[PDB]
Design a protein around this ligand. Sequence first.
Ligand SMILES: *[C@@H]1O[C@H](CO)[C@@H](O[C@@H]2O[C@H](CO)[C@@H](O[C@@H]3O[C@H](CO[C@H]4O[C@H](CO)[C@@H](O)[C@H](O)[C@@H]4O)[C@@H](O)[C@H](O[C@H]4O[C@H](CO)[C@@H](O)[C@H](O)[C@@H]4O)[C@@H]3O)[C@H](O)[C@H]2NC(C)=O)[C@H](O)[C@H]1NC(C)=O
Ligand SMILES: *[C@@H]1O[C@H](CO)[C@@H](O[C@@H]2O[C@H](CO)[C@@H](O[C@@H]3O[C@H](CO[C@H]4O[C@H](CO)[C@@H](O)[C@H](O)[C@@H]4O)[C@@H](O)[C@H](O[C@H]4O[C@H](CO)[C@@H](O)[C@H](O)[C@@H]4O)[C@@H]3O)[C@H](O)[C@H]2NC(C)=O)[C@H](O)[C@H]1NC(C)=O
Ligand SMILES: *[C@@H]1O[C@H](CO)[C@@H](O[C@@H]2O[C@H](CO)[C@@H](O[C@@H]3O[C@H](CO[C@H]4O[C@H](CO)[C@@H](O)[C@H](O)[C@@H]4O)[C@@H](O)[C@H](O[C@H]4O[C@H](CO)[C@@H](O)[C@H](O)[C@@H]4O)[C@@H]3O)[C@H](O)[C@H]2NC(C)=O)[C@H](O)[C@H]1NC(C)=O
Ligand SMILES: *[C@@H]1O[C@H](CO)[C@@H](O[C@@H]2O[C@H](CO)[C@@H](O[C@@H]3O[C@H](CO[C@H]4O[C@H](CO)[C@@H](O)[C@H](O)[C@@H]4O)[C@@H](O)[C@H](O[C@H]4O[C@H](CO)[C@@H](O)[C@H](O)[C@@H]4O)[C@@H]3O)[C@H](O)[C@H]2NC(C)=O)[C@H](O)[C@H]1NC(C)=O
Ligand SMILES: *[C@@H]1O[C@H](CO)[C@@H](O[C@@H]2O[C@H](CO)[C@@H](O[C@@H]3O[C@H](CO)[C@@H](O)[C@H](O)[C@@H]3O)[C@H](O)[C@H]2NC(C)=O)[C@H](O)[C@H]1NC(C)=O
Ligand SMILES: *[C@@H]1O[C@H](CO)[C@@H](O[C@@H]2O[C@H](CO)[C@@H](O[C@@H]3O[C@H](CO)[C@@H](O)[C@H](O)[C@@H]3O)[C@H](O)[C@H]2NC(C)=O)[C@H](O)[C@H]1NC(C)=O
Ligand SMILES: *[C@@H]1O[C@H](CO)[C@@H](O[C@@H]2O[C@H](CO)[C@@H](O[C@@H]3O[C@H](CO)[C@@H](O)[C@H](O)[C@@H]3O)[C@H](O)[C@H]2NC(C)=O)[C@H](O)[C@H]1NC(C)=O
Ligand SMILES: *[C@@H]1O[C@H](CO)[C@@H](O[C@@H]2O[C@H](CO)[C@@H](O[C@@H]3O[C@H](CO)[C@@H](O)[C@H](O)[C@@H]3O)[C@H](O)[C@H]2NC(C)=O)[C@H](O)[C@H]1NC(C)=O
Ligand SMILES: *[C@@H]1O[C@H](CO)[C@@H](O[C@@H]2O[C@H](CO)[C@@H](O[C@@H]3O[C@H](CO)[C@@H](O)[C@H](O)[C@@H]3O)[C@H](O)[C@H]2NC(C)=O)[C@H](O)[C@H]1NC(C)=O
Ligand SMILES: *[C@@H]1O[C@H](CO)[C@@H](O[C@@H]2O[C@H](CO)[C@@H](O[C@@H]3O[C@H](CO)[C@@H](O)[C@H](O)[C@@H]3O)[C@H](O)[C@H]2NC(C)=O)[C@H](O)[C@H]1NC(C)=O
Lengths: 107, 107, 106, 107, 107, 105, 142, 142, 143, 150, 153, 142
Amino acid sequence: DESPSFNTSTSLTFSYNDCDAELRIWSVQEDDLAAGLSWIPFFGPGIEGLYTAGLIKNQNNLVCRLRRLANQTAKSLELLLRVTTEERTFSLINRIAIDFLLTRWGG
Amino acid sequence: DESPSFNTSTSLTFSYNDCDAELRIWSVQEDDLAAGLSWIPFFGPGIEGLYTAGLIKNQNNLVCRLRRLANQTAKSLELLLRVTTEERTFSLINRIAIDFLLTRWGG
Amino acid sequence: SPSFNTSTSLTFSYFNDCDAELRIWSVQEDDLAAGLSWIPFFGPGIEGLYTAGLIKNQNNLVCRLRRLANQTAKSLELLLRVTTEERTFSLINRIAIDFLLTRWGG
Amino acid sequence: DESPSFNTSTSLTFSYNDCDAELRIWSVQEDDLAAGLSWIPFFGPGIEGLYTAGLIKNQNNLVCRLRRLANQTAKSLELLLRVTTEERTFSLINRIAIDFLLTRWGG
Amino acid sequence: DESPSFNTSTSLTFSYNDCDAELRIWSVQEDDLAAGLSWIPFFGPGIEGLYTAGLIKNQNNLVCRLRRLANQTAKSLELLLRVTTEERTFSLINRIAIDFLLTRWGG
Amino acid sequence: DESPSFNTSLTFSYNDCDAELRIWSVQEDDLAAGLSWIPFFGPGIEGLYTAGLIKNQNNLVCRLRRLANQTAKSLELLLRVTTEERTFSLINRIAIDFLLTRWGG
Amino acid sequence: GTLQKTEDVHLMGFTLSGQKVADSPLEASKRWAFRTGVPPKNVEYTEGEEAKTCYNISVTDPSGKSLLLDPPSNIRDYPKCKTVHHIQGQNPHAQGIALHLWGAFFLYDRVASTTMYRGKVFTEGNIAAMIVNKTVHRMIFS
Amino acid sequence: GTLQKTEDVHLMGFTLSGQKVADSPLEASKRWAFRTGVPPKNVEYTEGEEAKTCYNISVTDPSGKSLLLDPPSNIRDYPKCKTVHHIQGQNPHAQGIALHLWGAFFLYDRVASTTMYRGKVFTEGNIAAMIVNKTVHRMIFS
Amino acid sequence: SGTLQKTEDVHLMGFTLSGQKVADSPLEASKRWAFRTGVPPKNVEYTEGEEAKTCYNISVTDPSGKSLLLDPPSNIRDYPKCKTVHHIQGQNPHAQGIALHLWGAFFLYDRVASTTMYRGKVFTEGNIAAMIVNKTVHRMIFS
Amino acid sequence: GTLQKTEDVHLMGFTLSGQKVADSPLEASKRWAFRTGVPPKNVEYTEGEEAKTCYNISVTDPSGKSLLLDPPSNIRDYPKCKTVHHIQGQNPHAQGIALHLWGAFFLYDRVASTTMYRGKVFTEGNIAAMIVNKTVHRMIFSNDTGCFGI
Amino acid sequence: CSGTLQKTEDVHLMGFTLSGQKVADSPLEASKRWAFRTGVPPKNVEYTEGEEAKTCYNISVTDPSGKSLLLDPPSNIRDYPKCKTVHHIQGQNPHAQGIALHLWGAFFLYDRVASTTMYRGKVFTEGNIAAMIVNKTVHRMIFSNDTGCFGIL
Amino acid sequence: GTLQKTEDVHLMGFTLSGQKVADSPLEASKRWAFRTGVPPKNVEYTEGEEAKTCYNISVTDPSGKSLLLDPPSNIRDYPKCKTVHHIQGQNPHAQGIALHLWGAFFLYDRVASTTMYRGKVFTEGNIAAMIVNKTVHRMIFS
Ligand SMILES: *[C@@H]1O[C@H](CO)[C@@H](O[C@@H]2O[C@H](CO)[C@@H](O[C@@H]3O[C@H](CO[C@H]4O[C@H](CO)[C@@H](O)[C@H](O)[C@@H]4O)[C@@H](O)[C@H](O[C@H]4O[C@H](CO)[C@@H](O)[C@H](O)[C@@H]4O)[C@@H]3O)[C@H](O)[C@H]2NC(C)=O)[C@H](O)[C@H]1NC(C)=O
Ligand SMILES: *[C@@H]1O[C@H](CO)[C@@H](O[C@@H]2O[C@H](CO)[C@@H](O[C@@H]3O[C@H](CO[C@H]4O[C@H](CO)[C@@H](O)[C@H](O)[C@@H]4O)[C@@H](O)[C@H](O[C@H]4O[C@H](CO)[C@@H](O)[C@H](O)[C@@H]4O)[C@@H]3O)[C@H](O)[C@H]2NC(C)=O)[C@H](O)[C@H]1NC(C)=O
Ligand SMILES: *[C@@H]1O[C@H](CO)[C@@H](O[C@@H]2O[C@H](CO)[C@@H](O[C@@H]3O[C@H](CO[C@H]4O[C@H](CO)[C@@H](O)[C@H](O)[C@@H]4O)[C@@H](O)[C@H](O[C@H]4O[C@H](CO)[C@@H](O)[C@H](O)[C@@H]4O)[C@@H]3O)[C@H](O)[C@H]2NC(C)=O)[C@H](O)[C@H]1NC(C)=O
Ligand SMILES: *[C@@H]1O[C@H](CO)[C@@H](O[C@@H]2O[C@H](CO)[C@@H](O[C@@H]3O[C@H](CO[C@H]4O[C@H](CO)[C@@H](O)[C@H](O)[C@@H]4O)[C@@H](O)[C@H](O[C@H]4O[C@H](CO)[C@@H](O)[C@H](O)[C@@H]4O)[C@@H]3O)[C@H](O)[C@H]2NC(C)=O)[C@H](O)[C@H]1NC(C)=O
Ligand SMILES: *[C@@H]1O[C@H](CO)[C@@H](O[C@@H]2O[C@H](CO)[C@@H](O[C@@H]3O[C@H](CO)[C@@H](O)[C@H](O)[C@@H]3O)[C@H](O)[C@H]2NC(C)=O)[C@H](O)[C@H]1NC(C)=O
Ligand SMILES: *[C@@H]1O[C@H](CO)[C@@H](O[C@@H]2O[C@H](CO)[C@@H](O[C@@H]3O[C@H](CO)[C@@H](O)[C@H](O)[C@@H]3O)[C@H](O)[C@H]2NC(C)=O)[C@H](O)[C@H]1NC(C)=O
Ligand SMILES: *[C@@H]1O[C@H](CO)[C@@H](O[C@@H]2O[C@H](CO)[C@@H](O[C@@H]3O[C@H](CO)[C@@H](O)[C@H](O)[C@@H]3O)[C@H](O)[C@H]2NC(C)=O)[C@H](O)[C@H]1NC(C)=O
Ligand SMILES: *[C@@H]1O[C@H](CO)[C@@H](O[C@@H]2O[C@H](CO)[C@@H](O[C@@H]3O[C@H](CO)[C@@H](O)[C@H](O)[C@@H]3O)[C@H](O)[C@H]2NC(C)=O)[C@H](O)[C@H]1NC(C)=O
Ligand SMILES: *[C@@H]1O[C@H](CO)[C@@H](O[C@@H]2O[C@H](CO)[C@@H](O[C@@H]3O[C@H](CO)[C@@H](O)[C@H](O)[C@@H]3O)[C@H](O)[C@H]2NC(C)=O)[C@H](O)[C@H]1NC(C)=O
Ligand SMILES: *[C@@H]1O[C@H](CO)[C@@H](O[C@@H]2O[C@H](CO)[C@@H](O[C@@H]3O[C@H](CO)[C@@H](O)[C@H](O)[C@@H]3O)[C@H](O)[C@H]2NC(C)=O)[C@H](O)[C@H]1NC(C)=O
């Protein structure tokens, strides 16, 4: 489970054809909070209007370097799921957040 | 999603009318190790006897700051439950620990 | 939970009634990859997932892991009393955060 | 003890009153030794019903010399049983087969 | 019953899926004479240390044909054991050796 | 398990010795009595044995004694293999082994 | 800015009865509504506050069955309540999931949910986080 | 790169259709098989690429029941599709549950699974792990 | 010379004395039995045998109440085919040892010929013979 | 110490049979009891010991209903056992769930429990936590009766 | 002319188990191959070597009177040498008489003895023995309660 | 040479006293020892030499039970002995069966054993297999 980064300017510097150039995406809301009242679950957007659409453009051939991340993540994530015993959902965000700190404080 | 830290003397240090000065709580006690056998489930207190009551006194006007903390903690925590999808248990203590470890040791 | 570091099996840094022979079973992921054997369809079932091995009692290691099997039970029961979820509880991330918390901090 | 070889010619060739011509004997499945589920002992014949009945015809003066053979076998057989000290059942066909192999290899 | 021969070179030629390739077996001993005094029963290994472990390799499909052979010869062995009346254990080795001596005379 | 054979000058084909060898043997003249083969007319347990002597003419007594002394090593390994605790016979095994090694030679 | 060990975290539940919010059942019913399409969410906390009022409400349809969701195995009653109100009602024009207008949480035994479950006594309140050690906690708690 | 908060970890899932993988249903069935003895596993992912084609496939038997596993309550239909193919089939010589041959994932609404579920719209694709903060994600998207 | 191709081609058949025109009524068939000490009993396995004409079932006890015959092993079973079974109850006070046959004949049981008489089992008197016949000749002559 | 990754933190379960605790079923059954009022808890471990004795137990009431809890979907049988003891029993006047008197754990396939599940083979033991390195782990690696009834 | 028998101590007669035959060896399913029958004597045969079994069975069957319906073992009957898992089942049968028998033809294997019946308190397995001839050179070259038990028919 | 009949083989038992080995009861008692874990075995032999010394030995525990095994029905006393020694004693730390240290056999009437039985007269010796026909047997015999 490797992960690139977001190093810009000092273009995008990434620290770890057979692609599609266009890539439009759906995402969880970033700025739904505009009137101070939509954050209530009763006044929320529901499940139909929950998702916001946008476009990701190819600046420094980022799209190919994300589509080629599919092999070397699904190779290891199957072996990660084979160890655990639960058939429920399984979050990986805390695992990566711990692992980055374990890598950074090696010395 | 704030997390204040209190330190003794300088009385408590807060660091990071519609409020009642009286604040009585119930908690899970930690002095049960002196019995020597209460850690076994068969010799434990059960469900109704699990709790110990106490009173938190107002030293540096910390009751009303806690009641104001709780009112806008929900503002962020409702969105934090909005993003995820699973319909049951989410212990946020690991999230707060990881955010605290990333915040004060970013570099 | 009392943790235990097997550094060097010489270093035994921490946070009769013993048997010297310790045979264990485990999931060894080193040989489990095997090219295209990480597929769930090209893979092993429930009976066949595990390996077998033995642990050598070099510096009296098994006889202190069993005393560790004592000395972490009380803390684990007091940890499971506080929680309210009745299915299985992940515990590795808690130890991983606690290691960095007691490593550097206040 | 001695044993003749009652064999066919291709007059009838034999080998190495007080008589009854009729000889009705009991035997162990004269033919059809195999079946679907008869070799198993759970669906087997049983201890009282595994014996078939046959009648040997006295066609070339056959029964009478067999009776005279049996009445003279006892002289060798009791002296053979006198030497051994075991009091359980004593098989004998292996001795006859080894005697046949030893005697036919005359040089 | 059946008894095959298994010879090496003057080639693994034989004479006369639903199986496992691995065949781990226990045997008495290849040669305990190298110890020097292991043949004395007082210096012997006993019941619990009598056997040694081995692994027959299925590089020329021996194991599966042997597993087939046992199920084919079970019927003939039950038909052989039905005829005898002794309830003690019956040794078949001399029977097989005499049958091998009688079954072949051509050359 | 060695088994030497004698010859009709006696060719043999496969201190700690006493030259005088006397044995007890099963009766042979009893067969010629005529009625003594019947168990009721038999001699019994005690009268079943005849004493005899083996002469030492071509040092066969000493080689028989060392034959027994080296045969007891081979026989006891054979007794270790079997699972029966009652009286076990070896006559048929020696006869089948003689037939099996006679075919090769 | 000091957190030695992982159980120094605390999530406390604070009720609106201690904030002087009108908590009689006549005017507490208009902070509750029904809406379809929003899944329920729940989050676990550690300690709580004794509440002046707690509620025990089951609402059925004209066909007889309750509109409230079946509570899971981990849902229990609220530990300490001074006054418990039992209300049986009927609403034919609404269907769906019970939700809170102010965004406050329905509090149960160490579970704060965004919905109402049948047969379980809850209260209304929020949850808050703090970082204290044992030394402060022994001198702040009686 | 250094992230300041746990929320910055994004997990986009990209479908196979962006690699010019053929996606006609008459030949896609060789990427699916049935097997006994493998439990299913789910992974939560934050966002994902949509699909040019989506599938709604149920497999029946001569006895009339569905050989596919029932979905849990967190399994939802896939959010964005362009041309979904509602397919009904029948297979009398299959046992166990459904698995993908390439090791790819059956993507659903923010849940990726290694098995098929009854009556749910999915796609085929993998997921990737990465970190972008708010500023770099704001100079993109917009 | 000799046609012996398999080990189970050797048959051991036991023929009764009654087929040899020997008197077998129990009044004069009891003079071929006696008692003797010091001789171990012997048993021999056979395969098949002649259908018997008259069999016997004999219990002999002392005046103290104990049987003079032996306890039969688990191998010993009743004789298969008996047309007439004679049951004799007797008592001999001055006999000791085991029962033995005066003519040297065998006490035939179910495929076991014995030199002694057992308790509670039905036997006959007969002698066994050994011969070699293959499958085809046996199917030709046996009927 | 040294901790570079996350999956090198191991939780392995040690049985009580390797602790010289006598575990024949006629006398190992007095470490078990029944109690009302406690929830059952589960914890996930990784590796484990080969068990000398394992138990497959059933406890019924006089009406024919089993007093042990229904097993969840994540509970499986214990992987390696040298001897499996099958036990059937009944108890008329005990209600609740089954608990261990010594505070130990009921070990299953990578799940340790504080209760006894119906129809599943378990053992008794305690799980233990440690941190190893990859190279170090390459180096050091090759009705019967009225049971219960307090 | 493959006359490879030179002497008789070339005894190599393995007894192969049914667990390697892909036959189900669970204790609940293996009980359907066993039943009681009277009127059949028990028979034993001697083998010298064999496989290492996967599963083995400790079985005791009683009556309501408390007497075991399995025969007592002779002095040569011992426990089976290699067993990865031994299953201990105690049950009873109130309506079966006779001795225990196998319904396929397989033998109950013990320590170097194959039987057609079960014995009291002894550990066995299922299997069939096969007889074959190899010499020393080739073998050195290769080498390395519950109630209703047994139901009824 | 040649072998004609099956009865032409013989198994003669030669005693150790003919090997110029000392045979006093105190000196011959150190070749016998007790051991558990081995079954006893028996072998038939046809004839043999009569020994100079024979032994009738009973060994009991202090509680009274003899450690030696009961004799089977085929075991009898040794046929001819010049001198028979009756030695009895006790041993509290002996368990198991009796065995011979040199690997020799305990000779009885036509049965050679690896163990020592209770109340039967034996000797020490080894047996040998040898083939002489009846033609030249009387040339050697007498
Ligand atoms: C990871 O990165 C790779 C980089 O290549 C991306 O590309 C695909 O990779 C997969 C996995 O290796 C490829 O799938 C395999 O390709 C081979 C196809 O070659 C056969 O077919 C072509 C024309 O169809 C002919 O040259 C000839 O017939 C070849 O034989 C085969 O190895 C595989 O198919 C066979 O697999 C086994 C082996 O026999 C059999 O069981 C099957 O029935 C079948 O015959 C297999 O299909 C794929 O081709 C690559 N695509 C391209 C466009 O190159 C991946 O996208 C990327 N991600 C993953 C794997 O998730
Ligand atoms: C065939 O016949 C031969 C003789 O012709 C027998 O050979 C004898 O074998 C036994 C085997 O145990 C020998 O006994 C051993 O002798 C040694 C004793 O040392 C004393 O004697 C030697 C020489 O006489 C001198 O050094 C000195 O006097 C010593 O005092 C030791 O090596 C052995 O002791 C072992 O046993 C004792 C008792 O348990 C313990 O201390 C130890 O275990 C120790 O290892 C042993 O006693 C004997 O010497 C041999 N005889 C001769 C004349 O050499 C064969 O046994 C026989 N075969 C059969 C099958 O019967
Ligand atoms: C802690 O955080 C909570 C929420 O978690 C805050 O509570 C908010 O309080 C505000 C201010 O009171 C609420 O906003 C408005 O409140 C009014 C409710 O008053 C009722 O009662 C009075 C009687 O005294 C009468 O005016 C009348 O009966 C009212 O019903 C109303 O003005 C508004 O409600 C509705 O009014 C009419 C319908 O009656 C509609 O036209 C309106 O659109 C509206 O729906 C309105 O609610 C607010 O609701 C509370 N929640 C939130 C989420 O903001 C606390 O103030 C805060 N505490 C601190 C110290 O910060
Ligand atoms: C040598 O090896 C072979 C396999 O390679 C073994 O052969 C097996 O022999 C057994 C003998 O009992 C066979 O079992 C019989 O099967 C029939 C029904 O079984 C299933 O049949 C089909 C299978 O798909 C389905 O309908 C269903 O699953 C059935 O369960 C019946 O003929 C027999 O039932 C008999 O017993 C039951 C008792 O419960 C009663 O109904 C009747 O008495 C009935 O006659 C029986 O169960 C088995 O099928 C064979 N296997 C194969 C693969 O052919 C040999 O046993 C083995 N030899 C040995 C070990 O000695
Ligand atoms: C909160 O309110 C609900 C309103 O339903 C209460 O639930 C009801 O509780 C009663 C008392 O336990 C239940 O009655 C019992 O039900 C069963 C079946 O009849 C049986 O155990 C008893 O005979 C008894 O009748 C009742 O069924 C239940 N209602 C529902 C719909 O489940 C609940 O008790 C209230 N909580 C408190 C703390 O008062
Ligand atoms: C994908 O295909 C599945 C079937 O494989 C579709 O599910 C079907 O959806 C319809 C319409 O909602 C269901 O009918 C309704 O079901 C219930 C029955 O209690 C009830 O609400 C209504 O009376 C109505 O009959 C139908 O049952 C359901 N089928 C199955 C097997 O679950 C699904 O809609 C398809 N999805 C898309 C996006 O096309
Ligand atoms: C030959 O004569 C002997 C001796 O009289 C007969 O043996 C006897 O057989 C009967 C019938 O089986 C036995 O009676 C049974 O005994 C027990 C205890 O009562 C029980 O199983 C039955 O209720 C029945 O009464 C009797 O004990 C037995 N006597 C001896 C001494 O063993 C034998 O049957 C005769 N053979 C025939 C007629 O073929
Ligand atoms: C430990 O013992 C228990 C019983 O005390 C065994 O559980 C039993 O397992 C069998 C096989 O899976 C179950 O049979 C099945 O039941 C249902 C009937 O509707 C069905 O799925 C199948 O047709 C099959 O017959 C049986 O019900 C079950 N018994 C109980 C009481 O749960 C368990 O297998 C034993 N463990 C081992 C390792 O032997
Ligand atoms: C197969 O199960 C049988 C069930 O009877 C096991 O036999 C039993 O083994 C135990 C342990 O050795 C015996 O207990 C001991 O017995 C005596 C007399 O009490 C004494 O030495 C000890 O105090 C101890 O209690 C038990 O008696 C014995 N049962 C019988 C009927 O003999 C057998 O061990 C099992 N097989 C395996 C391989 O585990
Ligand atoms: C070798 O020594 C043993 C003893 O170690 C001798 O055995 C003993 O023999 C006598 C005479 O036969 C037995 O006495 C008789 O026993 C029974 C009652 O037990 C009865 O028939 C008579 O009333 C008489 O008392 C004695 O019991 C027996 N002792 C033992 C322990 O079995 C044996 O005779 C000696 N052999 C030689 C050849 O000297």
